[PDB]
């Protein structure tokens, strides 16, 4: 019982740590994509502003 309990606790903590790490990884990747899209969108607006100023 003690060995099984120790093994179960070790497995549960690792699985919880792995799940949290994956969840953070997915959130960071999605957040990075969102920031890149906004930066990319801002670049297009800057180009349009530059083109209008040139005219």
């Amino acid at each position: 019982e003690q060995l099984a309990n120790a093994r179960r606790d070790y497995e549960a903590e690792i699985a919880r740590a792995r799940q949290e790490a994956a969840k953070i990884v997915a959130q960071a990747q999605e957040r990075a994509k969102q920031q890149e899209a906004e930066i990319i969108a801002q670049a297009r607006r800057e180009a349009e502003r530059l083109k209008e100023e040139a005219r």
């Binding site: 800057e46 502003r49 530059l50 100023e53 040139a54």
Partner: protein, 50 residues
């Protein structure tokens, strides 16, 4: 800032174009005015020191 620098350069380039156009117009007009004015005394200017 890049847009602002572009406007400054664009105005500067426009300034250079205007200066070149004015120079060409002055040259064309200067030729007309000089021909009607005559150039009899130009020789005298060639011996102020030589």
């Amino acid at each position: 800032a890049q847009a602002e620098q572009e406007r400054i350069r664009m105005l500067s380039e426009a300034k250079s174009q205007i200066a070149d156009l004015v120079t060409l117009t002055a040259s064309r007009v200067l030729g007309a005015e000089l021909q009607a004015r005559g150039h009899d005394a130009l020789i005298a200017e060639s011996l102020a020191a030589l």
